[PDB]
Design a protein around this nucleic acid. Structure first.
Lengths: 203, 153, 50, 371, 119
RNA sequence: GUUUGACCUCAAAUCAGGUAGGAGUACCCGCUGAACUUAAGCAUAUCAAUAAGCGGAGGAAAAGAAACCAACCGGGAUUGCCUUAGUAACGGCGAGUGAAGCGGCAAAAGCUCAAAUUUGAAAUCUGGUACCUUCGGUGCCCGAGUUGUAAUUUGGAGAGGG
RNA sequence: GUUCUUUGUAAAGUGCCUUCGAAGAGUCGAGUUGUUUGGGAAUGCAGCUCUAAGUGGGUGGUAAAUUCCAUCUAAAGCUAA
RNA sequence: GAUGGGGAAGCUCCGUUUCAAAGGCCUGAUUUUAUGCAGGCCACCAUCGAAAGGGAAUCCGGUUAAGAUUCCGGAACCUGG
């Protein structure tokens, strides 16, 4: 079907066709509110590969967030400390902006459980996204065991904990020696390596 | 209301901005006479309504309960193909004889490649105005496409 | 509500009983009486119009 | 407390503009007028227009706001909203080209029933008989007018059926007690469990429609009166044990479509008005009306035959022959002859006045009307 | 010494209302007798009988509402189970038992076999 | 036809059925986040990727069945302990910081979607109504869904045809 | 332990020959800057720019080019101990 | 100091009409489509915020161990219906 056609056309963002469609879409979104529910996804193949069905209880939420480095929340930029605090405006906001958009759409739709999100547009002042969502309360999701896993309380607010794939990327969770600092949680491995074990029979 | 001015400015931007040739091939729609003829032809092969489908199900069940040749007693089906992925799959096979394409699909990217793939495979195609007119014969709110893999002699 | 129980306020008089002068060759007494009364009712408007 | 804002209580609260009622009901004033015709709500005149209208002198109508509050709970408004949604659904089915879906939707619906309104509005069934006079009058009026637009003639057929049923019941029970012919029609009166019930029967002649009247309100009143008279005839038939609705021979309807249709049958006489002209077998000339006269002789128990029945098809037992021709054809010496008027005075009195009177061409007494 | 609830259960609702009005009048009289007396231990009993009659009338109305609502969905929220807020959000046993046809065929094809290692 | 309906979008509902706020917060998942102290009085470094503040669930949480570890006769979900090791390594090579493979043990489970024309039948499903054997089942009626709901396949494999 | 019924015209598995084997894009990757790591030529995270291919891509603890080999298939997801 | 919105990872900040679809009045057989609301007018903002700011209205006599223009006698005045 259209799967691979749209999957390849999305890759040609520099093509004049996507070049004009992206401008029309960024303008239509700039006319719209920073947070609003898109009636349908603009990239059906992307949501389809992100696990979204087209059935009741699923939801899509277009979102907008300002680009730029984090500014430290202190008056006049005061250091109140050692000089080495270079670049008070240079803070990079360790969490990815997509994670912030997911947290915003989840705060707007806290009854819904965030699952995944994908880039759809961006501008100089914003980076647009279209986070998908599902309602655990809907009977269609509670049935069809393939999608019922979200109903578990542990899955609540997955975006806030970083369980979303953007959050898993920001956390560094990946196999390999390169991720040894955060292969299983940075704070967890730090507390484990720093522990002073003391058996009743000292070694 | 802000949504009204938003859609109006969107149409004004679509009219004012230059468009790549692959877009704007829509609005070169088939003439109303040939379009009405194509719809008068497609109307004969509308997909079966769910009530008629349940009637055929009861008929085949009564036939299997007493008769022979299970599921074969019914005549061959004859209905326009309408599924978008199914329509694209019918092309490059190639059982499709014609492929209608709505000009007003909300995601323009979904159908921009359809005319090009049809020109590559050589299957006849046309861009009828209005997805709703294609969906009315389909017994659905919208179908965005229509095709005829088979027809009565 | 009790307000429904009360009858609608009365308006111009009406009676189910037909007048005796519309009685299939009405007797000359009541017939002439009804004719005189309708003639007076018409003559009043005719005088006002004149 | 604090100043009570004069234009907040009293007549301003007890009374409200009819447009305000249509807005509170949000029913577009049409279903509102229909329910008001059904619920019995009527316009009311405030004793002080300045208070009810916030001092305006305009002749604004007022409808006893609490009565409209009682109207808000009426299920029939919900049924009207359901019919409004069904109309849009039928429009969608017709615009989509799926006519079979429109037929399936038309099959899956039922008209609203007024019987609950007939029960809440008329407790003590004889009290329902007290208002019957308007119902029989409106039904006999609508039955006679030629079918026309906004009628569809089905209402005329139901009215003619209910009228024939009421006439057959009045004939089988011999409830007639007085008659009064008039230029506007043949007036009638009959007891109903001892209650009097006057009613008028329009002459069976074509009549022009002024079109100046609001026909829709007359149709709603006819529907209400039809439901009321239907419940009344059902109770009257169950009380007598007669099967209802009465069966009818279709061949009799194709001949004259007269009172003979809808023969009554079970699942002394009033003495004198009942069983009048007992054992008599009257005959009637074509020129005299057949329906208005045959119903009276049948309610009196006399047999009736008409020359009009001979147009399509015995006279071996006739004891009388009504005639009104200016010069009657030579009469049989053994058969009595009399003008139609003789039956009317005989019903008005019951004394069986001598046959020598009312003999054609001799002039009849003017009316000797009972009233 | 005071009304017995099992005796009250047999009474009709009007009888329970009359007994409640009588106990209320007796309590209103004992309230004056208490200020007229150094102590009124007896007042403690009638106030408990009033609460007993009220609880009996409440149980009667509750069982009646449970009877009229029996056998239909969406019972009144006060009658709904009060296990805990978390359990109401927990999936129903029919939902937890749901399985896709693929996993069902995979389970029917190779159910966990029983075995032991002796010979 | 100077009329209607359909599609798309957006609003009103004290509309029918639902969900989130909060508290607790020892443990967990993330953000933000200092200095006292130590190296001469230090601006790299140490304190510390800590204290405080903030958001999110549980009885555990996260992670979890590799774009792994290894260069060997190669092992093979994640997690915890011993050892690797106070070693490789980092650090005005100063203070000080500082891991990971292999080996033994505790406990062992698999796998699921997108990417397939069913097209000889959208076979899927939310909701209302009536009934019953009521954590649900059946008939009927609206609706979601053809811009894609079920089965068929998740690379270990796997699909049309014989 | 027994007790009513089937599902068994329905569903699953194993061999050979044949043609097939789609598998994730503002992503990976690289430039610059902030933070952090034992990671040391820049381990991981993060802001801005550039930004692709499928006999392809990542990894092979010293930065590059050339001829090769060893192991997996990221940019989707659930799972008690 | 909310609401509609714009910031902020966030506890929460800005703003009080600012880029909001911010309801309350009249007519009616709206004349022909017959059981489908058709035709007209309007207009800024929630809320809190002074017991000395504006306010709708009571005067005398008598009375308690302690209350009064509030309690009793008399004669008054304002608001709504």
């Amino acid at each position: 079907g259209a799967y691979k056609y749209l999957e390849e056309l999305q890759r040609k963002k520099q093509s004049d066709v996507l070049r004009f469609l992206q401008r029309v879409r960024v303008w239509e979104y700039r006319q719209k509110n920073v947070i609003h529910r898109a009636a349908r996804p603009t990239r059906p193949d992307k949501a389809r590969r992100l696990g979204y069905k087209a059935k009741q209880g699923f939801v899509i939420y277009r979102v907008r967030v300002r680009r730029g480095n984090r500014k430290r929340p202190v008056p006049k930029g005061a250091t109140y400390g050692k000089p080495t605090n270079q670049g008070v405006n240079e803070l990079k906001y360790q969490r990815s902006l997509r994670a912030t958009a997911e947290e915003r759409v989840g705060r707007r739709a806290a009854n819904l459980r965030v699952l995944n999100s994908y880039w759809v547009n961006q501008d100089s002042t914003y980076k647009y996204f279209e986070v998908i969502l599902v309602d655990p309360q809907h009977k269609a999701i509670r049935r069809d065991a393939r999608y019922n896993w979200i109903c578990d309380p542990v899955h609540k607010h997955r975006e806030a904990r970083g369980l979303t794939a953007t959050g898993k990327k920001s956390r560094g969770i990946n196999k390999g020696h390169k991720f040894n600092n955060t292969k299983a949680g940075r704070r967890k491995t730090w507390k484990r390596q720093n522990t002073l074990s003391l058996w009743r029979y000292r070694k | 209301p802000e949504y009204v001015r938003v859609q109006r400015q969107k149409k004004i931007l679509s009219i004012r901005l230059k468009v790549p040739p692959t877009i704007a091939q829509f609005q070169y729609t088939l003439d109303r006479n040939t379009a009405a003829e194509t719809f008068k032809l497609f109307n004969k092969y509308r997909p079966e309504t769910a009530a008629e489908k349940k009637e055929r199900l009861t008929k085949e069940a009564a036939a299997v309960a007493e008769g022979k040749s299970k599921q074969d007693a019914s005549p061959k089906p004859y209905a326009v193909k309408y599924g978008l992925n199914h329509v694209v799959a019918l092309i490059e096979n190639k059982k499709a004889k014609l492929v209608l394409i709505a000009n007003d699909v909300d995601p323009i990217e979904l159908v921009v490649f359809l005319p090009a793939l049809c020109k590559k495979m050589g299957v006849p195609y046309a861009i009828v105005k209005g997805k709703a007119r294609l969906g009315t014969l389909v017994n659905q709110k919208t179908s965005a496409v229509a095709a005829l893999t088979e027809v009565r002699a | 509500p009790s307000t429904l129980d009360i009858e609608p306020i009365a308006v111009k008089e009406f009676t189910e009983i037909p007048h005796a002068g519309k009685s299939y060759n009405p007797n000359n007494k009541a017939w002439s009486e009804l004719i005189n009364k309708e003639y007076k009712e018409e003559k009043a408007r005719e005088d006002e119009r004149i | 407390m604090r100043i009570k804002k004069k234009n907040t209580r009293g007549n301003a609260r007890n009374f409200i503009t009819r447009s305000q009622a249509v807005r509170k009901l949000q029913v577009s004033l049409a279903d509102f007028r229909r329910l008001c015709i059904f619920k019995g709500i009527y316009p009311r005149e405030p004793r002080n227009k300045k208070k009810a209208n916030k001092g305006s002198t305009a002749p604004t109508t007022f409808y006893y706001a609490k009565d409209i509050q009682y109207l808000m709970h009426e299920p029939v408004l919900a049924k009207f909203r359901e019919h409004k949604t069904f109309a849009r659904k039928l429009t969608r089915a017709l615009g989509r080209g799926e006519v079979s879906s429109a037929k399936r939707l038309e099959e899956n619906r039922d008209s609203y029933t007024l019987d609950h309104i007939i029960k809440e509005r008329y407790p003590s069934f004889p009290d329902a008989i007290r208002d019957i006079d308007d119902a029989l009058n409106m039904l006999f009026l609508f039955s006679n007018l030629p079918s026309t637009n906004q009628v569809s003639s089905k209402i005329i057929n139901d009215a003619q059926k209910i009228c024939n049923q009421w006439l057959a019941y009045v004939a089988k029970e011999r409830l007639v007690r007085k008659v009064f012919v008039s230029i506007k029609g043949v007036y009638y009166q009959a007891n109903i469990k001892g209650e009097e019930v006057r009613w008028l029967v329009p002459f069976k002649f074509p009549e022009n429609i002024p079109s100046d009247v609001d026909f829709r309100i007359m149709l709603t009143f006819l529907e209400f009166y039809s439901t009321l008279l239907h419940f009344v005839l059902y109770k009257l038939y169950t009380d007598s044990g007669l099967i209802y609705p009465p069966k009818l021979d279709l061949k009799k309807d194709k001949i004259i479509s007269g009172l003979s249709s809808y023969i009554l049958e079970s699942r002394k006489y009033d003495s004198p008005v009942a069983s009048l002209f007992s054992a008599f077998v009257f005959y009637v000339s074509r020129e005299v009306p057949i329906d208005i006269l045959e119903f009276l002789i049948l309610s009196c128990g006399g047999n009736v035959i008409s020359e009009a029945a001979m147009d399509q098809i015995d006279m071996s037992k006739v004891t009388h022959q009504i005639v009104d021709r200016p010069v009657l054809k030579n009469k049989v010496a053994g058969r009595t002859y009399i003008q139609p008027q003789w039956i009317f005075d005989c019903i008005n009195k019951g004394e069986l006045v001598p046959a020598n009177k009312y003999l054609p061409g001799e002039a009849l007494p003017p009316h000797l009307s009972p009233w | 010494a005071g009304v017995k609830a099992y005796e009250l259960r047999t009474k009709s609702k009007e009888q329970l209302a009359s007994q409640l009005v009588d106990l209320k009048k007796e309590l209103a009289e004992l309230k004056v007798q208490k200020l007229s007396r150094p102590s009124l231990p007896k007042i403690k009993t009638v106030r408990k009988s009033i609460a007993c009659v009220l609880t009996v009338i409440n149980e009667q109305q509750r069982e009646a509402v449970r009877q009229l609502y029996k056998g239909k969905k969406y019972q009144p929220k006060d009658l709904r189970a009060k296990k805990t807020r978390a359990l109401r959000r927990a999936l129903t046993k029919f939902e937890a038992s749901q399985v896709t046809e693929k996993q069902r065929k995979k389970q029917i094809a190779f159910p966990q076999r029983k075995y032991a290692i002796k010979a």
